[PDB]
Structure formats: C-alpha cells, structure tokens
mmCIF file of C-alpha atoms in Angstrom:
data_model
loop_
_atom_site.group_PDB
_atom_site.id
_atom_site.type_symbol
_atom_site.label_atom_id
_atom_site.label_comp_id
_atom_site.label_asym_id
_atom_site.label_seq_id
_atom_site.Cartn_x
_atom_site.Cartn_y
_atom_site.Cartn_z
ATOM 1 C CA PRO A 545 14.399 36.707 -64.329
ATOM 2 C CA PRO A 546 14.544 39.770 -62.054
ATOM 3 C CA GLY A 547 15.970 39.057 -58.574
ATOM 4 C CA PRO A 548 14.190 39.898 -55.312
ATOM 5 C CA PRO A 549 14.451 43.237 -53.487
ATOM 6 C CA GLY A 550 17.682 44.358 -51.775
ATOM 7 C CA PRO A 551 18.107 44.512 -48.005
ATOM 8 C CA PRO A 552 16.203 47.325 -46.182
ATOM 9 C CA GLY A 553 18.168 50.523 -45.244
ATOM 10 C CA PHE A 554 18.918 51.310 -41.593
ATOM 11 C CA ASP A 555 16.985 54.000 -39.816
ATOM 12 C CA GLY A 556 18.734 57.301 -39.095
ATOM 13 C CA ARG A 557 20.247 58.234 -35.731
ATOM 14 C CA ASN A 558 17.897 59.796 -33.231
ATOM 15 C CA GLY A 559 18.405 63.546 -33.089
ATOM 16 C CA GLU A 560 20.175 64.970 -30.070
ATOM 17 C CA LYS A 561 18.609 66.235 -26.814
ATOM 18 C CA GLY A 562 16.848 69.562 -26.961
ATOM 19 C CA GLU A 563 18.746 72.382 -25.349
ATOM 20 C CA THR A 564 18.201 73.467 -21.790
ATOM 21 C CA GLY A 565 15.775 76.296 -21.144
ATOM 22 C CA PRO A 566 17.207 79.508 -19.760
ATOM 23 C CA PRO A 567 16.758 80.468 -16.055
ATOM 24 C CA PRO B 409 19.065 40.550 -63.557
ATOM 25 C CA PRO B 410 19.706 41.808 -59.988
ATOM 26 C CA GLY B 411 16.504 42.831 -58.117
ATOM 27 C CA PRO B 412 15.344 46.350 -57.203
ATOM 28 C CA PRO B 413 16.921 48.363 -54.416
ATOM 29 C CA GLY B 414 16.048 47.695 -50.764
ATOM 30 C CA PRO B 415 13.678 50.241 -49.311
ATOM 31 C CA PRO B 416 15.139 53.373 -47.673
ATOM 32 C CA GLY B 417 15.601 53.470 -43.862
ATOM 33 C CA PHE B 418 13.427 56.001 -42.009
ATOM 34 C CA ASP B 419 14.872 59.372 -41.050
ATOM 35 C CA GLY B 420 15.916 59.502 -37.422
ATOM 36 C CA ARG B 421 13.482 60.472 -34.724
ATOM 37 C CA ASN B 422 13.800 64.079 -33.629
ATOM 38 C CA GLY B 423 15.441 65.040 -30.364
ATOM 39 C CA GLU B 424 13.387 65.477 -27.234
ATOM 40 C CA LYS B 425 12.367 69.043 -26.471
ATOM 41 C CA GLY B 426 14.646 70.821 -24.012
ATOM 42 C CA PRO C 655 18.382 31.551 -62.918
ATOM 43 C CA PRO C 656 16.228 34.276 -61.260
ATOM 44 C CA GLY C 657 18.648 37.055 -60.214
ATOM 45 C CA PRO C 658 20.376 37.773 -56.892
ATOM 46 C CA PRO C 659 18.846 40.293 -54.478
ATOM 47 C CA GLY C 660 18.970 44.066 -55.184
ATOM 48 C CA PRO C 661 21.359 46.626 -53.669
ATOM 49 C CA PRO C 662 21.107 47.675 -50.025
ATOM 50 C CA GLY C 663 18.436 50.365 -49.372
ATOM 51 C CA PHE C 664 19.784 53.803 -48.487
ATOM 52 C CA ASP C 665 19.916 54.711 -44.800
ATOM 53 C CA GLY C 666 17.733 57.418 -43.268
ATOM 54 C CA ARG C 667 19.095 60.848 -42.372
ATOM 55 C CA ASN C 668 19.991 61.897 -38.826
ATOM 56 C CA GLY C 669 17.058 63.143 -36.807
ATOM 57 C CA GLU C 670 16.808 66.818 -35.964
ATOM 58 C CA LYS C 671 17.985 68.225 -32.642
ATOM 59 C CA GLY C 672 15.126 68.851 -30.269
ATOM 60 C CA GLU C 673 13.523 72.110 -29.197
ATOM 61 C CA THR C 674 15.222 74.301 -26.643
ATOM 62 C CA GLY C 675 13.163 74.283 -23.479
ATOM 63 C CA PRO C 676 11.371 77.397 -22.224
ATOM 64 C CA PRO C 677 12.898 79.910 -19.809
ATOM 65 C CA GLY C 678 12.462 79.131 -16.048
ATOM 66 C CA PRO C 679 9.848 80.471 -13.598
ATOM 67 C CA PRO C 680 10.594 83.831 -11.973
ATOM 68 C CA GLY C 681 12.395 83.649 -8.574
#
C-alpha cells in the first residue's frame, strides 16, 4: 500500500533588512 | 510503495522596509 | 506492509530584501 506523506519542507530564510534611506 | 513528497516549505518573509 | 513515508518536502526560497527607505527630511 502507498506510504504516508514525507516530512514538511523548511521555510525559507527571512529576507535581509531594507536599505537605509538617503539623507 | 513510498508515500508522496512532503509539502514544500514557505518562501521566506520579505525584508523590512528601509 | 503499507509503505514508508515519502521524501522530504522542498524548502522555501530566501525572502526578498526589503525596500530602501525614503530620503530624509530637509535640514
């Protein structure tokens, strides 16, 4: 019989800080 | 037979606005 | 017997870099 579903994937890394605004 | 694939992870959260 | 579990799910992609902030107030 078919087995059960595989383990869930991991979520991706959070994107990196937005860049500073200019003066 | 081996089961179906695990579900995909979610894409990462976006970066905070500057 | 009923089969073993499936393969690991794929991982999500990296998140996008955030928005550049706006320019500062005049001096």
